[PDB]
């Protein structure tokens, strides 16, 4: 499992935003600490906050960072164009025997044009490929800013993240984002479920598409 | 300073093996657990491995274990991982970072090293398989739908789609492939057409893996 983290988090020159870090009973109500790095486009990641709430020494006071039950959260005063990185929590899970566990990343980003919600088309798996022995959910995903998204899979109710495919967000030619996920199953598991879903998770946006046999 | 410098990775096929090390220095090395946590591209951060100071305590992430080897020699301030089995969906950035000390609660990684790429790729060509996606207004404006070719399991990049014969441009958008996780690449290619021409216009997609030599022309009807 993994700490749950906004996509995309931003803001105009000198906002305060904050970032959420949503975990459960086994890793941050289990009795450990959050931590927080940021991690500078195209560097390896820093340390930003460790022990829920202490700065290393270098890090501004802009930065703040709390714990409060099975959530964390990092607020960062006077947002700036130093600030734009991706940021990851991190705590520690007694599941499995133990592991360190990482949040999902979040995506800081100074406006430099309004946010866009992108648009989400959902396609079943064709009938030519069932007849192959296979089955492939085609989730596009396009003209979305800033260009950061979540996509979740679920079988009827239930969350699948076996045989998910996601990409990274490309820039469309008008200057938007653009993302693709596909969903693989057998086709027994097509057949045999009510419905599967893909969520698209944006800023202040969910959009869920469903497709049934 | 404290310094950790990542090196050993490499380009290797799936079943290959890889060494990496990390040569610390600025600390005293024998006095800190050490750790190698990845990054796949355009990915999160996945913790790897854990050994303790003086090596009495091994861990690994369920992903690697019985593959990955991770030891230390705190003679030569050096961290290892013997890389196993390697498999596409390893391929990642590897740091190396140190956990800090910590009264409780689970410490923190104090210290970060720039990475070493681990690129993990069969160099064997794959031509496509192409499938219909049927036509669906649900997600489209009034009186138009959506009808698109997926273009699987190919390598390498890149394939060309066409739609008609290049024909139809209007409200083509072919999305950039998935590397998936089995080192092979997916994409769709998806074209908004008005409604009322589904029953009479004909809509081929024309895929060109040039790499393999493979042609497939598709045509995608309603259902």
């Known amino acids: 499992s993994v700490l749950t983290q906004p996509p995309s988090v931003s803001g105009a020159p000198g906002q305060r935003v904050t970032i959420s870090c949503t975990g459960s009973?086994?890793?941050?109500?289990?009795?450990?600490?959050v931590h927080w790095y940021q991690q500078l486009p195209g560097t390896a990641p820093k340390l930003l906050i460790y022990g829920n709430s202490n700065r290393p020494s270098g890090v501004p006071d802009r930065f703040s960072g709390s714990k409060s039950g099975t959530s964390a959260s990092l607020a960062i005063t006077g947002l700036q164009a130093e600030d734009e990185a991706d940021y990851y929590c991190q705590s520690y899970d007694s599941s499995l025997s133990g592991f360190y566990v990482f949040g999902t990343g979040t995506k800081v980003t100074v406006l430099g044009q309004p946010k866009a919600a992108p648009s989400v088309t959902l396609f079943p798996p064709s009938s030519e490929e069932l007849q192959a022995n296979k089955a492939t959910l085609v989730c596009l995903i396009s003209d979305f800013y800033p260009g950061a998204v979540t996509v979740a899979w679920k079988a009827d109710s239930s969350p699948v993240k076996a045989g998910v495919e996601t990409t990274t967000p490309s820039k469309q030619s008008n200057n938007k984002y653009a993302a693709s996920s596909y969903l693989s199953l057998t086709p027994e598991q097509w057949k045999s479920h009510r419905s599967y879903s893909c969520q698209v998770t944006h800023e202040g946006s969910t959009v869920e598409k469903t497709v049934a046999p | 300073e404290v310094q950790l410098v990542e090196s050993g990775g490499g380009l290797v096929k799936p079943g290959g093996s890889l060494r990496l090390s990390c040569a610390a220095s600025?600390?005293?090395?024998?006095?800190?657990?050490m750790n190698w946590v990845r990054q796949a591209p355009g990915k999160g951060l996945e913790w790897v491995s854990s050994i303790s100071s003086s090596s009495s305590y091994i861990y690994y992430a369920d992903s690697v274990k019985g593959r990955f080897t991770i030891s230390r020699d705190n003679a030569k301030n050096s961290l290892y991982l013997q890389m196993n089995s390697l498999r596409a969906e390893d391929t990642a950035v590897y740091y190396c970072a140190r956990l800090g000390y910590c009264s409780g609660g689970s410490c923190h990684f104090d210290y970060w090293g720039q990475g070493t790429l681990v690129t993990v790729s069969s160099a064997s060509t794959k031509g496509p398989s192409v499938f219909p996606l049927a036509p669906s207004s649900k997600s489209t404006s009034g009186g138009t739908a959506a009808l698109g070719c997926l273009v699987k399991d190919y390598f390498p990049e890149p394939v060309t789609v066409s739609w008609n014969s290049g024909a139809l441009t209007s409200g083509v958008h072919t999305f950039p492939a998935v590397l998936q996780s089995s080192g092979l690449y997916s994409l769709s290619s998806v074209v908004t057409v008005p409604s009322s021409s589904l029953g009479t216009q004909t809509y081929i997609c024309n895929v060109n893996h040039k790499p393999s030599n493979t042609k497939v022309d598709k045509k995608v009807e309603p259902k």
């Open positions: 009973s086994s890793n941050i109500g289990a009795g450990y600490d």
């Open positions: 600025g600390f005293t090395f024998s006095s800190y657990s």
